[PDB]
Write an enzyme that holds these catalytic residues in place. Structure first.
Site, PDB file in Angstrom:
ATOM      1  N   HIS A  28      72.177  51.937  10.892  1.00  0.00           N
ATOM      2  CA  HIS A  28      73.101  52.934  11.502  1.00  0.00           C
ATOM      3  C   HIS A  28      74.300  52.241  12.127  1.00  0.00           C
ATOM      4  CE1 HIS A  28      70.592  56.865  11.342  1.00  0.00           C
ATOM      5  NE2 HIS A  28      70.469  56.108  10.224  1.00  0.00           N
ATOM      6  N   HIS A  65      63.486  52.345   3.059  1.00  0.00           N
ATOM      7  CA  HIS A  65      62.359  53.326   3.056  1.00  0.00           C
ATOM      8  C   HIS A  65      61.104  52.654   2.481  1.00  0.00           C
ATOM      9  CE1 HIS A  65      65.331  56.922   3.701  1.00  0.00           C
ATOM     10  NE2 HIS A  65      65.353  56.018   4.726  1.00  0.00           N
TER      11      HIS A  65
HETATM   12  C1  HEM Z   1      70.675  58.584   1.546  1.00  0.00           C
HETATM   13  C2  HEM Z   1      70.574  57.602   2.457  1.00  0.00           C
HETATM   14  C3  HEM Z   1      69.589  57.769   3.557  1.00  0.00           C
HETATM   15  C4  HEM Z   1      69.064  58.898   4.142  1.00  0.00           C
HETATM   16  C5  HEM Z   1      69.385  60.361   3.927  1.00  0.00           C
HETATM   17  C6  HEM Z   1      68.119  58.469   5.105  1.00  0.00           C
HETATM   18  C7  HEM Z   1      67.416  59.339   5.943  1.00  0.00           C
HETATM   19  C8  HEM Z   1      66.511  58.916   6.926  1.00  0.00           C
HETATM   20  C9  HEM Z   1      65.819  59.760   7.820  1.00  0.00           C
HETATM   21  C10 HEM Z   1      66.024  61.251   7.893  1.00  0.00           C
HETATM   22  C11 HEM Z   1      65.013  59.004   8.595  1.00  0.00           C
HETATM   23  C12 HEM Z   1      64.076  59.504   9.705  1.00  0.00           C
HETATM   24  C13 HEM Z   1      64.663  59.413  11.107  1.00  0.00           C
HETATM   25  C14 HEM Z   1      63.536  59.718  12.087  1.00  0.00           C
HETATM   26  O1  HEM Z   1      63.050  60.877  12.084  1.00  0.00           O
HETATM   27  O2  HEM Z   1      63.043  58.835  12.809  1.00  0.00           O
HETATM   28  C15 HEM Z   1      65.135  57.677   8.118  1.00  0.00           C
HETATM   29  C16 HEM Z   1      64.374  56.609   8.552  1.00  0.00           C
HETATM   30  C17 HEM Z   1      64.623  55.298   8.175  1.00  0.00           C
HETATM   31  N1  HEM Z   1      65.619  54.877   7.345  1.00  0.00           N
HETATM   32 FE1  HEM Z   1      66.701  55.967   6.181  1.00  0.00          FE
HETATM   33  N2  HEM Z   1      68.002  57.143   5.056  1.00  0.00           N
HETATM   34  C18 HEM Z   1      68.918  56.659   4.215  1.00  0.00           C
HETATM   35  C19 HEM Z   1      69.200  55.343   3.938  1.00  0.00           C
HETATM   36  C20 HEM Z   1      68.664  54.250   4.552  1.00  0.00           C
HETATM   37  C21 HEM Z   1      69.078  52.881   4.394  1.00  0.00           C
HETATM   38  C22 HEM Z   1      70.257  52.415   3.610  1.00  0.00           C
HETATM   39  C23 HEM Z   1      68.239  52.097   5.191  1.00  0.00           C
HETATM   40  C24 HEM Z   1      68.204  50.615   5.412  1.00  0.00           C
HETATM   41  C25 HEM Z   1      68.448  49.760   4.418  1.00  0.00           C
HETATM   42  C26 HEM Z   1      67.349  53.013   5.867  1.00  0.00           C
HETATM   43  C27 HEM Z   1      66.265  52.627   6.627  1.00  0.00           C
HETATM   44  C28 HEM Z   1      65.427  53.521   7.260  1.00  0.00           C
HETATM   45  C29 HEM Z   1      64.255  53.065   8.047  1.00  0.00           C
HETATM   46  C30 HEM Z   1      63.734  51.664   8.210  1.00  0.00           C
HETATM   47  C31 HEM Z   1      63.732  54.186   8.581  1.00  0.00           C
HETATM   48  C32 HEM Z   1      62.512  54.267   9.440  1.00  0.00           C
HETATM   49  C33 HEM Z   1      62.729  54.373  10.943  1.00  0.00           C
HETATM   50  C34 HEM Z   1      61.438  54.228  11.746  1.00  0.00           C
HETATM   51  O3  HEM Z   1      60.407  53.620  11.283  1.00  0.00           O
HETATM   52  O4  HEM Z   1      61.522  54.593  12.946  1.00  0.00           O
HETATM   53  N3  HEM Z   1      67.645  54.297   5.449  1.00  0.00           N
HETATM   54  N4  HEM Z   1      66.066  57.652   7.096  1.00  0.00           N
END
Ligand code: HEM
Ligand code: HEM
Ligand SMILES: [Cl-]
Ligand code: NA
Ligand code: NA
Lengths: 712, 712
Positions: free
Chosen positions: A77, A244
């Site tokens: 972010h 993810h």
């Molecule tokens: C289309 C692109 C993306 C969308 C729509 C998206 C959406 C989301 C959403 C909705 C969450 C959940 C937030 C929460 O409720 O805690 C999340 C979690 C996460 N996203 Fe993504 N994401 C995207 C791309 C990425 C990218 C590029 C990365 C890193 C390279 C990333 C890494 C993560 C990680 C590690 C989590 C887990 C957070 C946790 O364990 O607390 N995301 N993402």
């Protein structure tokens, strides 16, 4: 209290040029972050971050006993606000800890992530910036969970106030498209310079476009927003599937449970926000996005289980406990571990935007290759994660510490090393005289050096005269750069360079990048001499010439000036008044309002205008460096009116006779209209100002010539 | 473009502490206006101004062929924004040329007046400020038209952007009272710190209160608003009758003819506004206020004709050609000259507010005395014009040039001249040892020196420790000053003074003003010693002790701190939150956000709180100079909640046990909540910051001790 912005909501805002004053900065004027970082024990910081990953705080319990996923999201972010259109956003200023980004809905509960890091920030103090720490923490999260990163550079100095960024015109968080302030027009065309689909999102809506759970449609928004953050299809698939691989989403209960974002919260919340009334409000009960998805069977370990799940199951549209659209694996066993209860397991789940990576035909081919070849996946993700987190750091010279990757990447706009002695003061004087003896005019020399140096933007530290990329595609063919006039100047300078370099001993030689700047310096000295003033313009050698093969022509497209008030240039008609685009350009160039004013007044009388336009050329001694622009603009003997042909072009007539004296654009006349800019024009247009005008002009000229000189 | 102010319109604005940075200022950082003005040929400027008076420009023709009346209004309006409540407004920063004042309805057509002065401003350049020039022009107008002025001081440095002033909350220009943002409540009580009856007026409504033409009720508003601009009944009558000896009002046709104010006007208007469609839109056809009144038979010459008319006729309510309420002399002949047509004469006319000077019984007695003793009127007007135009210039030490009146006036808060040798470094070491050997504590020394020095406000440069007025009425009685404790400290310091002065030869002596500041410096040194730090606090002698008879007790009342966050003091419950009052106080003390942050953290642990409150005293080593305030404030081991009894008092409890550790106010906790203040607190609360905290604290302590030291 009613403010000037209430009374006059459309007046120009100059305050954006006067941010980041010594006043607001708690560090001494002598503080050098690079000096502090270079003595940091980075290995000791990384051991503390490693311990932190599995040290749960009760005020925000760690999912699966590991904060890694949370900190990867935090770092993604931090970097994910970046837009190529202006270079604004990104991780490079640590702006996640300020308004508005600290309170964006997509940054919900990253306040907790930043608070977890305060003990380590406190221990190491000024030797590690919040901006570097957010990215380093993301790298250590990945390393701790078995992922080999591509490397890390320090050197992101902390900032002390919010950046002035246009994030869009919506007045409602997450407003769906098609509102009174819609960021979309035509066939889903996202307005420049935005790179997110909704106010307060990083890229896209994880449910689907405006909440429509269609992975194919979602893929369109993904491709568009990622391209606007400098990522192609391979990089985009690698980042999303890479991220993810880790952690989970948080949607344990209805969103109506979640209270004020940090900027709106009570003083007792002490800079945190999104306090939830749902059961414990945290850990197993956490609500962040409102989705409840855990992607892999080992959320705290690098794997290739994201693609195994994506391709190994068919997916069913379902609702989180918060009522958000998400997907579950049809006929699956409970194979995914619970974040807190070692006796519970769950079916595989996916976001709409995850399924994009399978149902968009172009993403599908990449995702299949990554599935079949997870070593290719790991390498693409490592490279993309480095690019993401470093994209706004500027030249490789700014990169600090022992983990900088040695590989030179095309996206860095690389500058070759200088292997040879530089020209000295006497050499510079010889080359200036040879340039002026060639017959190149003041207008040609100043226009060329301006065109080369003024591509710099301080938002992502891209552009500048280093590289001599003005001679390459695509800069040499930009309309603003006057391609046929530019080609003739560069041919003459290259012949001067060849002759000077031919005559040398000891391997001393001058780059074309240096000679283009030094030639511009000679033009400014000649213009001062034309005015009857002997000045020396400073010049620092050590620029090098980049090749076409070292230049990504597509990435260079975003640096094209389609508006450059300093050349009275507008490529077409825009929503935004030209004077607003001038102040935007001055902000990118890191100019104050005084610097913008003196620079523009001087460039007008030097002949810097594109097309040799007379607009704003308020002098009868063009190519002399005088304060004539200001004296003539402020002359109440002249009356101004918009033309019949063009409301954006003004005639200045003798108030008594009606004789036509001048023409000017909005960019010219704003200096006689805006109450703060007119006050600046008055200083430079006073009878005592000729020496001050020359000095100040030379100073801001030299500043612009040096914007990209991080080697110094 | 949506802004942080749009999202969070109640969050604190720190940008008011970082105005007037080197960034926005076109002058070099070493520019010294006093030195430039001292070289000005003031005689030459005044000859030019005398020439200008009757050099009519066709774009705004001179009434009666003499601009003198317009310029007197211009200078009166420059000075007339001043409020005694906060010292903001006044002539001293030339703010009439910036938003919003350049566009206030009451400043209509003063854009024309300032534009007439551009050629003289241009000719003399940086050697005369706009701020000085507006007042000097008013003086010359009076001298040109036969009135001998009391004198003139230069030294008002120009400013380069709008001052952050609360002018009121109304969202409509000139809104009448009782609206949703009324500045009035109860029995026509005007809210502090305002000093005008409607948004965009200088003082009162010339038609009468909220447009009701009752001279008696109008007199009440005149008295109240003039008292809130530091003027008593005599000064107020002298100023209104003196001003309205000259020139005329402008209301030749309906106000609907008059277009956009300068900040709203098109770019072609080149900084002017109120363009009128009525006939020629200027001169005989001018529309400014909408009233059409000419007071005297010789509007371009000093006369006694104002009071002859006021008393010599009975007055009939009538309407201007714009529809405004004004008054015509019953049965009078046409004795008043026309401004343009020698063939026309007019009956005497008066504003409602002019008739106030006759029909308010207390004004009537002064007006009659002035009518019967015109020399008394001339002297009162001359003195009141001087005071009006210099009220915000600060100590007489700031007054420049050859026309400064020798006479010392009570309203200047005069400091006696020093006529004896000053203490040296040896003496200062001896006095500090005596102070520390007396038994006075760190808390007593720091609190007293803070109380003395922190009355300063840079808005009108009143207050500060010079004069030792903390020992006089009313400062010695102010609740914030802890009168009983103060008396004990002063008694001990006066005994040290007496013994030191008694032992001297050669006429050497120390003022109490100097000893109070030096004793506070000893307290800070002792506190640093208590913390194991070897620190020397700079000290500059040369303050003198003012008498009670040199201290106007009623004028001093407006300096009383009813909110001082630096002492965690609030005299009662205000509508404005305490942290907004803290930033307001920091602005008056000329502090940046970092300075405010370090000062407040240090004062808390030194024991500067009123009543020895524990609120914000986040240390177990009180009276030791440490960064404890920051380290403890930022400790995530502590959870904060507002008390039952008091929503404005917070309890800090151990997160794990629930044990009370601390209490704090809004002023304390804002440093843990506001995203920019928390970033500053983090620097001072880091493990590497103890020595930085101490050295920054000593710097800002010294800054406050020297705020009024214009003798240096
Ligand atoms: C289309 C692109 C993306 C969308 C729509 C998206 C959406 C989301 C959403 C909705 C969450 C959940 C937030 C929460 O409720 O805690 C999340 C979690 C996460 N996203 Fe993504 N994401 C995207 C791309 C990425 C990218 C590029 C990365 C890193 C390279 C990333 C890494 C993560 C990680 C590690 C989590 C887990 C957070 C946790 O364990 O607390 N995301 N993402
Ligand atoms: C109760 C206080 C006051 C009221 C309500 C008031 C009101 C006005 C108004 C409505 C005008 C006409 C503006 C126009 O249409 O051009 C005016 C003109 C003027 N006022 Fe006052 N005024 C007051 C006090 C003062 C004071 C204290 C001074 C100066 C010492 C002053 C000097 C003048 C002068 C010289 C003009 C004539 C301007 C010209 O010739 O263009 N007034 N006043
Ligand atoms: Cl520092
Ligand atoms: Na950026
Ligand atoms: Na003031």
């Amino acid at each position: 209290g009613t403010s000037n912005r209430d009374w006059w909501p459309n007046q120009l805002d100059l305050s954006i040029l006067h941010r980041h004053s010594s006043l607001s900065d708690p560090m001494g004027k002598d503080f050098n972050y690079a000096q502090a970082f270079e003595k940091l024990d980075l290995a000791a910081v990384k051991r503390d971050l490693h311990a932190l990953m599995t040290t749960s705080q009760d005020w925000w319990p760690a999912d699966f006993g590991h904060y890694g996923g949370l900190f990867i999201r935090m770092a993604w972010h931090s970097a994910g606000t970046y837009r190529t259109a202006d270079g604004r956003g990104g991780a490079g200023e640590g702006q996640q800890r300020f308004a508005p980004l600290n309170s964006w809905p997509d940054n919900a509960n990253l306040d907790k992530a930043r608070r977890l890091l305060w003990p380590i920030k406190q221990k190491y103090g000024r030797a590690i910036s919040w901006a570097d720490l957010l990215i380093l923490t993301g790298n250590v999260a990945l390393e701790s969970m078995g992922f080999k990163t591509f490397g890390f550079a320090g050197g992101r100095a902390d900032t002390w106030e919010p950046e002035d960024v246009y994030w869009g015109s919506e007045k409602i968080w997450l407003e769906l498209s098609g509102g009174p302030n819609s960021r979309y027009s035509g066939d889903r065309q996202l307005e420049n310079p935005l790179a997110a689909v909704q106010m307060g999102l990083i890229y896209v809506n994880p449910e689907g476009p405006d909440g429509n759970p269609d992975p194919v449609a979602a893929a369109r928004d993904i491709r568009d927003t990622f391209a606007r953050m400098a990522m192609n299809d391979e990089e985009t698939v690698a980042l999303i599937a890479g991220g993810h691989t880790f952690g989970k989403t948080h949607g344990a209960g209805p969103a109506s449970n979640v209270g004020a974002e940090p900027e709106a919260a009570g003083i007792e919340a002490q800079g945190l926000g999104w306090k939830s009334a749902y059961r414990t409000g945290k850990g197993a009960d956490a609500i962040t996005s409102g989705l409840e998805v855990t992607w892999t069977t080992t959320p705290t370990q690098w794997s290739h289980n994201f693609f195994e799940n994506l391709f190994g199951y068919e997916w069913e549209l379902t609702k989180s406990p918060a009522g958000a659209h998400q997907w579950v694996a049809k006929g699956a066993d409970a194979v995914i571990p619970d974040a807190f209860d070692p006796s519970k397991k769950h079916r595989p789940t996916m976001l709409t935007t995850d399924l994009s990576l399978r149902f968009d035909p172009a993403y599908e081919k990449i995702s299949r290759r990554f599935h079949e070849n997870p070593e290719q996946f790991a390498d693409a993700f490592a490279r993309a994660w480095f690019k993401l987190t470093h994209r706004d750091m500027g030249p490789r010279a700014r990169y600090l510490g022992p983990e900088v990757p040695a590989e030179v990447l095309l996206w860095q706009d690389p500058i070759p090393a200088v292997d040879h002695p530089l020209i000295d003061a006497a050499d510079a004087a010889e080359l200036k005289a040879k340039v002026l003896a060639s017959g190149l005019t003041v207008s040609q020399l100043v226009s060329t050096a301006w065109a080369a140096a003024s591509t710099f933007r301080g938002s992502d530290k891209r552009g500048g005269a280093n590289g001599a990329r003005i001679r390459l595609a695509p800069q040499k063919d930009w309309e603003a750069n006057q391609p046929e006039q530019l080609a003739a100047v560069l041919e003459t300078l290259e012949a001067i360079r060849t002759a000077f370099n031919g005559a040398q001993r000891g391997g001393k030689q001058v780059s074309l990048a240096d000679l283009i700047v030094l030639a511009g310096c000679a033009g400014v000295e000649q213009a001062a001499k034309n005015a009857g003033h002997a000045v020396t313009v400073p010049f620092a050698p050590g620029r090098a010439d980049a090749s076409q093969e070292q230049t990504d022509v597509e990435s260079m497209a975003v640096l094209e000036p389609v508006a450059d008030g300093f050349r009275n240039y507008l490529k077409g008609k825009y929503r935004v008044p030209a004077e607003v685009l001038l102040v935007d350009k001055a902000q990118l160039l890191t100019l104050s309002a005084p610097e913008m004013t003196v620079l523009l007044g001087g460039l007008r009388v030097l002949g810097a205008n594109v097309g040799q336009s007379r607009h704003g050329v308020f002098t009868a001694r063009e190519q002399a460096l005088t304060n004539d622009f200001f004296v003539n603009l402020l002359d109440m003997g002249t009356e101004w009116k918009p033309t019949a042909a063009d409301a954006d072009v003004f005639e200045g007539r003798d108030r008594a006779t009606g004789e036509l004296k001048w023409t000017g654009t909005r960019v010219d006349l704003v200096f006689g209209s805006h109450s703060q800019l007119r006050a600046l024009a008055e200083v430079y247009g006073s009878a005592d100002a000729q020496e001050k005008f020359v000095r100040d002009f030379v100073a801001v000229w030299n500043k612009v010539m040096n914007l990209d000189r991080f080697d110094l």
